[PDB]
């Protein structure tokens, strides 16, 4: 679920408030269209697409599904007790968190005008 995703981000990117990823480019947070603005935005586009795939699983709701994961000593892991839905969502989140940690963050791409620039 989103709370756990937030914690993953805190796990992998301690040097930034998670809010910094909540409104970035065309895909980071609200927004699911247009040409990705940069590498970080591409991370979010992949995450968006990943959730769309997971929602094809019967009764699978990515924003709300609680999964089993662990964040310790610099390592993010999705546990083996997850059902198909939980495993899929946990992996979408994990890969995105890892993606965020390696992508440059450009302040000029925060809170851009989605209606005008993401067509
Ligand atoms: Ca999005």
Coordinates of N, CA and C and ligand atoms in Angstrom, one line a residue:
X1 N 0.8 -1.2 0.0 CA 0.0 0.0 0.0 C 0.9 1.3 0.0
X2 N 0.3 2.4 -0.3 CA 1.0 3.7 -0.4 C 1.8 4.0 0.8
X3 N 1.4 3.7 2.0 CA 2.1 3.9 3.3 C 3.4 3.1 3.2
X4 N 3.4 1.9 2.8 CA 4.6 1.0 2.7 C 5.5 1.5 1.6
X5 N 4.9 2.0 0.5 CA 5.8 2.5 -0.6 C 6.5 3.8 0.0
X6 N 5.8 4.6 0.7 CA 6.4 5.8 1.3 C 7.6 5.4 2.2
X7 N 7.5 4.3 2.9 CA 8.5 3.8 3.8 C 9.7 3.3 3.0
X8 N 9.4 2.6 1.9 CA 10.5 2.1 1.0 C 11.4 3.3 0.6
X9 N 10.7 4.3 0.1 CA 11.4 5.5 -0.3 C 12.3 6.1 0.8
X10 N 11.7 6.1 2.0 CA 12.5 6.6 3.1 C 13.7 5.7 3.4
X11 N 13.5 4.4 3.1 CA 14.5 3.4 3.3 C 15.7 3.6 2.3
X12 N 15.4 3.9 1.0 CA 16.4 4.0 0.0 C 16.9 5.4 -0.3
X13 N 16.1 6.4 0.0 CA 16.5 7.8 -0.2 C 16.3 8.6 1.1
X14 N 17.2 8.3 2.1 CA 17.1 9.0 3.4 C 17.5 10.5 3.3
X15 N 18.3 10.9 2.3 CA 18.7 12.2 2.2 C 17.6 13.2 1.6
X16 N 16.3 12.7 1.4 CA 15.2 13.5 0.8 C 13.9 13.2 1.4
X17 N 13.0 14.2 1.6 CA 11.7 14.0 2.1 C 11.0 13.3 0.9
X18 N 10.1 12.3 1.3 CA 9.4 11.6 0.2 C 8.5 12.5 -0.5
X19 N 8.0 13.6 0.1 CA 7.2 14.5 -0.6 C 7.8 15.0 -1.9
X20 N 9.1 15.0 -2.0 CA 9.8 15.5 -3.2 C 9.5 14.6 -4.4
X21 N 8.9 13.4 -4.2 CA 8.6 12.5 -5.2 C 7.1 12.5 -5.5
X22 N 6.4 13.2 -4.7 CA 4.9 13.2 -4.8 C 4.3 14.1 -5.9
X23 N 5.1 15.0 -6.4 CA 4.6 15.8 -7.5 C 5.8 16.2 -8.4
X24 N 6.2 15.3 -9.2 CA 7.4 15.5 -10.0 C 7.2 15.0 -11.4
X25 N 7.5 15.9 -12.4 CA 7.4 15.6 -13.8 C 6.0 15.2 -14.2
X26 N 5.8 14.4 -15.2 CA 4.5 14.0 -15.7 C 3.9 12.7 -15.0
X27 N 4.8 11.9 -14.4 CA 4.3 10.7 -13.9 C 4.4 10.5 -12.3
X28 N 5.3 11.3 -11.7 CA 5.5 11.1 -10.3 C 4.3 11.7 -9.4
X29 N 3.4 10.8 -9.1 CA 2.3 11.0 -8.2 C 1.0 11.1 -9.1
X30 N 0.3 12.2 -8.9 CA -0.8 12.5 -9.8 C -0.2 12.6 -11.2
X31 N -0.9 12.1 -12.2 CA -0.5 12.2 -13.5 C -0.1 10.8 -14.1
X32 N -0.6 10.5 -15.2 CA -0.2 9.2 -15.9 C -0.3 9.3 -17.4
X33 N 0.3 10.5 -17.9 CA 0.3 10.7 -19.3 C 1.4 11.6 -19.8
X34 N 1.7 11.5 -21.1 CA 2.7 12.4 -21.7 C 4.1 11.8 -21.8
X35 N 5.1 12.6 -22.2 CA 6.4 12.1 -22.4 C 7.2 12.4 -21.1
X36 N 7.8 11.3 -20.5 CA 8.6 11.4 -19.3 C 9.6 12.6 -19.4
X37 N 9.6 13.4 -18.4 CA 10.5 14.6 -18.4 C 12.0 14.3 -18.2
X38 N 12.3 13.3 -17.4 CA 13.7 12.9 -17.3 C 13.8 11.5 -16.7
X39 N 15.0 11.1 -16.3 CA 15.2 9.7 -15.8 C 14.3 9.4 -14.6
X40 N 14.2 10.3 -13.6 CA 13.3 10.1 -12.5 C 11.9 9.9 -12.8
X41 N 11.4 10.7 -13.8 CA 10.0 10.6 -14.3 C 9.8 9.3 -14.9
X42 N 10.9 8.8 -15.6 CA 10.8 7.5 -16.2 C 10.6 6.4 -15.2
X43 N 11.2 6.5 -14.0 CA 11.0 5.6 -12.9 C 9.6 5.5 -12.6
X44 N 8.9 6.7 -12.5 CA 7.5 6.8 -12.1 C 6.6 6.2 -13.2
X45 N 7.0 6.4 -14.4 CA 6.2 5.9 -15.5 C 6.1 4.4 -15.5
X46 N 7.3 3.8 -15.3 CA 7.4 2.3 -15.1 C 6.6 1.9 -14.0
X47 N 6.7 2.6 -12.8 CA 5.9 2.2 -11.7 C 4.4 2.3 -12.0
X48 N 3.9 3.4 -12.7 CA 2.5 3.5 -13.0 C 2.1 2.3 -13.9
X49 N 2.8 2.0 -14.9 CA 2.5 0.9 -15.8 C 2.5 -0.4 -15.0
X50 N 3.4 -0.6 -14.1 CA 3.5 -1.8 -13.3 C 2.2 -2.0 -12.4
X51 N 1.7 -0.9 -11.9 CA 0.4 -1.0 -11.1 C -0.7 -1.3 -12.0
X52 N -0.7 -0.8 -13.2 CA -1.8 -1.1 -14.2 C -1.8 -2.6 -14.5
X53 N -0.7 -3.2 -14.5 CA -0.6 -4.7 -14.8 C -1.1 -5.5 -13.6
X54 N -0.6 -5.0 -12.4 CA -1.1 -5.7 -11.2 C -2.6 -5.7 -11.0
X55 N -3.2 -4.6 -11.4 CA -4.6 -4.5 -11.2 C -5.5 -5.4 -12.1
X56 N -4.8 -6.1 -13.0 CA -5.4 -7.1 -13.8 C -5.7 -8.4 -13.1
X57 N -5.0 -8.5 -11.9 CA -5.2 -9.7 -11.0 C -6.5 -9.4 -10.3
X58 N -7.3 -10.5 -10.2 CA -8.6 -10.4 -9.6 C -8.5 -9.9 -8.1
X59 N -9.2 -8.8 -7.8 CA -9.3 -8.3 -6.5 C -8.0 -7.6 -6.0
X60 N -7.1 -7.3 -7.0 CA -5.8 -6.7 -6.7 C -5.9 -5.2 -6.8
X61 N -5.7 -4.5 -5.7 CA -5.7 -3.0 -5.7 C -4.4 -2.4 -5.1
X62 N -3.5 -2.1 -6.0 CA -2.1 -1.7 -5.6 C -2.0 -0.6 -4.6
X63 N -2.8 0.4 -4.6 CA -2.8 1.5 -3.7 C -3.1 1.1 -2.2
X64 N -3.9 0.0 -2.1 CA -4.4 -0.5 -0.8 C -3.9 -1.8 -0.3
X65 N -3.3 -2.6 -1.2 CA -2.9 -4.0 -0.8 C -1.7 -3.9 0.1
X66 N -1.9 -4.5 1.3 CA -0.8 -4.6 2.2 C 0.1 -5.8 1.9
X67 N 1.4 -5.6 1.7 CA 2.3 -6.7 1.4 C 3.3 -6.9 2.6
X68 N 4.1 -7.9 2.4 CA 5.1 -8.2 3.4 C 6.5 -7.8 2.8
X69 N 7.2 -6.9 3.5 CA 8.5 -6.5 3.1 C 9.4 -6.2 4.2
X70 N 10.7 -6.0 4.0 CA 11.6 -5.6 5.0 C 12.6 -4.6 4.5
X71 N 13.0 -3.7 5.3 CA 14.0 -2.7 5.0 C 15.0 -2.6 6.1
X72 N 16.2 -3.3 5.9 CA 17.2 -3.2 6.9 C 18.6 -3.3 6.4
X73 N 19.5 -2.5 7.0 CA 20.9 -2.5 6.6 C 21.1 -2.3 5.1
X74 N 20.4 -1.3 4.6 CA 20.5 -0.9 3.2 C 19.9 -1.9 2.2
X75 N 19.1 -2.8 2.6 CA 18.6 -3.8 1.7 C 17.1 -3.9 1.8
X76 N 16.4 -3.7 0.6 CA 15.0 -3.8 0.5 C 14.6 -5.1 0.0
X77 N 13.7 -5.8 0.7 CA 13.3 -7.2 0.3 C 11.8 -7.4 0.4
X78 N 11.2 -8.0 -0.6 CA 9.8 -8.5 -0.6 C 9.8 -9.9 -0.1
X79 N 9.1 -10.2 0.9 CA 9.1 -11.5 1.6 C 8.3 -12.6 0.8
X80 N 8.6 -13.8 1.1 CA 7.9 -14.9 0.4 C 6.5 -15.3 0.9
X81 N 6.0 -14.6 1.9 CA 4.7 -14.9 2.4 C 3.6 -14.2 1.6
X82 N 4.0 -13.4 0.6 CA 3.0 -12.7 -0.3 C 2.3 -13.5 -1.3
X83 N 1.0 -13.2 -1.4 CA 0.2 -13.9 -2.5 C 0.6 -13.2 -3.8
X84 N 0.0 -13.7 -4.9 CA 0.3 -13.2 -6.2 C 0.2 -11.7 -6.3
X85 N -1.0 -11.1 -5.8 CA -1.2 -9.7 -5.8 C -0.2 -9.0 -5.0
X86 N 0.0 -9.4 -3.7 CA 1.0 -8.7 -2.8 C 2.4 -8.8 -3.4
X87 N 2.8 -9.9 -3.9 CA 4.2 -10.1 -4.5 C 4.4 -9.1 -5.7
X88 N 3.4 -9.0 -6.5 CA 3.5 -8.1 -7.7 C 3.6 -6.7 -7.3
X89 N 2.7 -6.2 -6.4 CA 2.7 -4.9 -6.0 C 4.0 -4.5 -5.2
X90 N 4.4 -5.4 -4.3 CA 5.6 -5.2 -3.6 C 6.8 -5.0 -4.5
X91 N 6.8 -5.8 -5.6 CA 7.9 -5.7 -6.5 C 7.9 -4.4 -7.3
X92 N 6.7 -4.0 -7.7 CA 6.6 -2.7 -8.4 C 7.2 -1.6 -7.5
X93 N 6.8 -1.6 -6.3 CA 7.2 -0.6 -5.3 C 8.7 -0.6 -5.1
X94 N 9.2 -1.8 -4.9 CA 10.7 -2.0 -4.6 C 11.5 -1.5 -5.8
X95 N 11.2 -1.9 -7.0 CA 11.9 -1.5 -8.1 C 11.9 0.0 -8.3
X96 N 10.8 0.6 -8.0 CA 10.7 2.1 -8.1 C 11.5 2.8 -7.1
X97 N 11.5 2.3 -5.9 CA 12.3 2.8 -4.8 C 13.8 2.8 -5.2
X98 N 14.2 1.6 -5.7 CA 15.6 1.5 -6.1 C 15.9 2.4 -7.3
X99 N 15.0 2.6 -8.2 CA 15.1 3.5 -9.3 C 15.3 4.9 -8.9
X100 N 14.5 5.3 -7.9 CA 14.6 6.7 -7.3 C 16.0 7.0 -6.8
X101 N 16.6 6.1 -6.1 CA 17.9 6.3 -5.5 C 19.0 6.5 -6.4
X102 N 18.9 6.1 -7.7 CA 19.9 6.2 -8.7 C 19.7 7.3 -9.7
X103 N 18.5 8.0 -9.6 CA 18.2 9.0 -10.6 C 18.5 10.4 -10.0
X104 N 19.0 11.3 -10.9 CA 19.2 12.7 -10.5 C 17.9 13.4 -10.3
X105 N 17.8 14.3 -9.3 CA 16.6 15.0 -9.0 C 16.8 16.5 -9.4
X106 N 16.0 16.9 -10.4 CA 16.1 18.3 -10.9 C 14.9 19.1 -10.4
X107 N 15.3 20.1 -9.5 CA 14.3 20.9 -8.9 C 13.3 21.6 -9.8
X108 N 13.8 21.9 -11.0 CA 12.9 22.6 -12.0 C 11.8 21.7 -12.6
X109 N 11.8 20.4 -12.3 CA 10.8 19.5 -12.8 C 9.8 19.2 -11.7
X110 N 9.9 19.8 -10.5 CA 9.0 19.6 -9.4 C 7.7 20.4 -9.7
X111 N 6.5 19.9 -9.4 CA 5.3 20.6 -9.5 C 5.1 21.3 -10.9
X112 N 5.3 20.6 -12.0 CA 5.1 21.3 -13.3 C 3.6 21.2 -13.7
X113 N 3.3 22.0 -14.7 CA 1.9 22.1 -15.2 C 1.5 20.9 -16.1
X114 N 0.9 19.9 -15.4 CA 0.5 18.7 -16.1 C -0.4 18.9 -17.3
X115 N -1.4 19.8 -17.2 CA -2.3 20.1 -18.3 C -1.7 20.6 -19.5
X116 N -0.6 21.5 -19.3 CA 0.1 22.1 -20.4 C 1.3 21.4 -21.0
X117 N 2.0 20.6 -20.1 CA 3.2 20.0 -20.5 C 3.2 18.5 -20.6
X118 N 2.1 17.9 -20.3 CA 2.1 16.4 -20.3 C 1.0 15.9 -21.2
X119 N 0.9 16.5 -22.4 CA 0.0 16.0 -23.4 C 0.8 15.1 -24.4
Ligands
LIG1 CA1 1.6 8.6 -11.7

